[PDB]
Design a protein around this ligand. Structure first.
Ligand SMILES: *[C@@H]1O[C@H](CO)[C@@H](O[C@@H]2O[C@H](CO)[C@@H](O)[C@H](O)[C@H]2NC(C)=O)[C@H](O)[C@H]1NC(C)=O
Ligand code: NAG
Ligand code: ZN
Ligand code: ZN
Ligand code: ZN
Ligand code: ZN
Ligand code: ZN
Ligand code: ZN
Ligand code: ZN
Ligand code: ZN
Ligand code: ZN
Ligand code: ZN
Lengths: 105, 197, 105, 184
């Protein structure tokens, strides 16, 4: 395939986070699916090392692997939860919960 | 137990399509830990309540606003249909004493509030909490005294619902932001997740 | 395994970059090998999404993949090369050439 | 093709790793064209108008520029009577198709007394800075170098220039990025 952002809804009960997350119990986390195949275009914002390793992969595919398709930017969500001390906490921007951009690294 | 609906309503407010983003990113709810109540006397004709909390805000956080929510109600009194009118004042307790309540110690005035309707009242007491965060380990704080003064044509036993009662007890609402603009807070958030993981 | 940095020597002749890279002839680019298996410890600097996705993979291994072990920080090297116009260019810090840290994303 | 100076700089930068260079980006610009006029009775010195094609990105802040010339007595007999002289480089603002210094408008850059045969380095950062901020009014991106021989010396003390192919002049521009590496 091709490294791209896909949809992914996460129910916290399924992962067991219902034990402390009061809301929203379920949200859109997104997912980076696909592979980083040569050539790496601009739309995955490749780094020089990612480009190097990819070129090495072409030369030595049995010894060196290709770049991985990972989230480049992450977006916050609104989360109401309980602290470790049980203190009710509401955070309008709970950073790093959903994928904003995907890329090759 | 469960968090107050006020926190949930704040969440619902934030998640509803509001045109205005909140002033504070971090909001916490701190219920009262213990309460010392003294009935009205001839020398001091008002209800006295010393409320002890356990507020603990990280030093990397810069708090914006704090609210003390109390439930004002004529406490199931006879002739309670004669009205409900009065005022209440909250003091930050600096020095305490095991004699009476307001009849001793050291206090700083916070908020004066005239009351009418039975229900929840909100008192902006950000000042006290800021001093509690900046403890300096010299004076014993993290607590405050609330006095309830009834007017002439009012309820006999006008008061706020406090311990040892179990219905509509007082609690703190702290509005806070991160000093490092989210740098230090999200780090402590992460360590919490690995602990929950 | 464990998400960790491994050695990786890159000869520019092998990838064809000898056509413009004057120096050096080969350098240490490093590589992030291993997998992001539960639990993700501090030493891979996991993001909240990485933690979420990992827990989802355990719950739904047929739908969601685990986090990938990728370079988190990158270190520059000194590179002498020819510009697109053929102009000899020397850069003491040629950013993003070698892996400094690895992590789960 | 690349100057050994650039290669030496790389070796210099990679050796002395305990000392970071003042400039991160270094570029080499060879001479594009050269107009040479021999010495005359009216103007007793060698005249050279050197044209370059220096183009530095606007997101880059240049620190220092060097003009490297090869000073040499052009293979003359009776050159063993000594070797002494001087050379001067001017930034050319306005040119003219008659002679070299016998016309136009110039700004003085560097004066250099010379003795040993070999490569000389002239700090002419001022001109390059003016070339980046071109403003498209005057035809620049070029400079004139004059070579003056002292008394009882070589007949043709000069710098190696085109149409020769050995030890030709070239520019060395030291630059850093304004956005601290973000845009570059
Ligand atoms: C000097 O360098 C400039 C680059 O700025 C060259 O300009 C190019 O000229 C060609 C000629 O057709 C154009 O197609 C390009 O668009 C120009 N590039 C730019 C960025 O403007 C110029 O050709 C060079 N001169 C020599 C003699 O090599
Ligand atoms: C009060 O809060 C502190 C937070 O530092 C906690 O360590 C302590 O256990 C709490 N005490 C009670 C009685 O809840
Ligand atoms: Zn492949
Ligand atoms: Zn944010
Ligand atoms: Zn009396
Ligand atoms: Zn904090
Ligand atoms: Zn009043
Ligand atoms: Zn009144
Ligand atoms: Zn009455
Ligand atoms: Zn540049
Ligand atoms: Zn002679
Ligand atoms: Zn002199």
């Amino acid at each position: 395939s091709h490294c791209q952002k896909t949809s992914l809804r996460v129910n916290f009960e399924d992962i067991g986070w219902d034990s402390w997350i009061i809301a929203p119990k379920e949200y859109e986390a997104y997912e980076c699916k696909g592979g980083c195949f040569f050539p790496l275009a601009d739309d995955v914002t490749p780094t020089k090392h990612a480009i190097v390793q990819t070129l090495v992969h072409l030369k030595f595919p049995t010894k060196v692997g290709k770049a991985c398709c990972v989230p480049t930017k992450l977006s916050p969500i609104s989360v109401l939860y309980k602290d470790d001390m049980g203190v009710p906490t509401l955070k309008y921007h709970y950073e790093g919960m959903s994928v904003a951009e995907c890329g090759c690294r | 137990a469960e968090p107050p609906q006020y926190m949930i309503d704040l969440y619902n407010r934030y998640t509803t399509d509001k045109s205005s983003t909140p002033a504070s990113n971090i909001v916490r709810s701190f219920s009262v830990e213990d309460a010392i109540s003294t009935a009205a006397t001839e020398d001091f004709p008002f209800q006295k309540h010393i409320l002890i909390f356990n507020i603990s805000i990280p030093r990397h956080e810069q708090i914006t606003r704090a609210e003390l929510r109390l439930y004002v109600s004529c406490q199931n009194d006879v002739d309670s249909t004669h009205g409900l009118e009065g005022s209440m004042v909250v003091y930050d307790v600096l020095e305490d004493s095991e004699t009476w309540d307001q009849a001793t110690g050291t206090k700083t005035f916070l908020v004066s509030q005239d009351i009418r309707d039975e229900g929840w009242e909100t008192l902006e007491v950000s000042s006290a909490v800021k001093r509690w965060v900046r403890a300096d380990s010299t004076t014993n704080k993290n607590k405050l005294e609330v006095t309830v003064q009834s007017h002439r044509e009012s309820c006999d036993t006008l008061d706020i619902s406090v311990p040892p009662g179990s219905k509509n007890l007082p609690f703190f609402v702290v509005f806070s932001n991160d000093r490092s603009n989210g740098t230090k807070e999200t780090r402590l958030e992460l360590k919490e997740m690995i602990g929950h993981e």
